[PDB]
Amino acid sequence: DPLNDPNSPLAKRSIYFDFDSYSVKDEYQPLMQQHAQYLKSHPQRHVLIQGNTDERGTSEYNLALGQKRAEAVRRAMALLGVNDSQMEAVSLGKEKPQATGHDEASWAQNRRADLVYQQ
């Protein structure tokens, strides 16, 4: 399965965001196109889009920002043709940092939406 091929374009699973932004940067449109093509040619595959933030700001603010990040990715893949039935969008806010330091080297890694396939 290309989903389990570490050298497929699908091996990249994450979209990164600028500070206090849920704009999907154009440099991630190709990645979204690749995953969209996968989902449209594997109609029983479902993906969970998880939005995350860096630690700056309240838990409440970042739950909402993470949700906008996940919803922005879901919308972009919907525009690329993915049927809504194969996607869900959820927020982890700032609660599940990947990088655990307290400067921009960590925070940039945490302003992130992940495509998590149900396997």
Residues that bind ligand OXL (CB under 6 A): 19-20, 53-54, 56-57, 62, 65, 111
Binder among 42, 45, 46, 56 for a second copy (CB under 8 A): 56
80 in Cβ contact with 33 (< 8 Å):
yes
Nearest residue (beta carbon) to ligand OXL = 53
Site string for a second copy, 9-48 (x = CB under 8 A): --xxxx----x-----------------------------
Give SS3 for 32: helix
Q: What letters, b where the CB count within 10 A reaches 16 and e where it falls short, cover 39-70?
A: beeeeebebebbbbbbbeeeeeebbbbbbbbb
Q: Which amino acid is at 43?
A: P
Q: Does 83 bind a second copy (CB under 8 A)?
A: no
User: Nearest approach, Cβ of 88 to ligand OXL (angstroms)?
Assistant: 21
User: Nearest approach, Cβ of 95 to ligand OXL (angstroms)?
Assistant: 12
Distance CA 112, CA 99 (A): 11
Count CB-CB contacts under 10 A for residue 73: 28
Q: Which residues are at the interface with a second copy (CB under 8 A)?
A: 4, 6, 11-14, 19, 50, 56-57, 96, 98, 100-104, 108, 114-116, 119
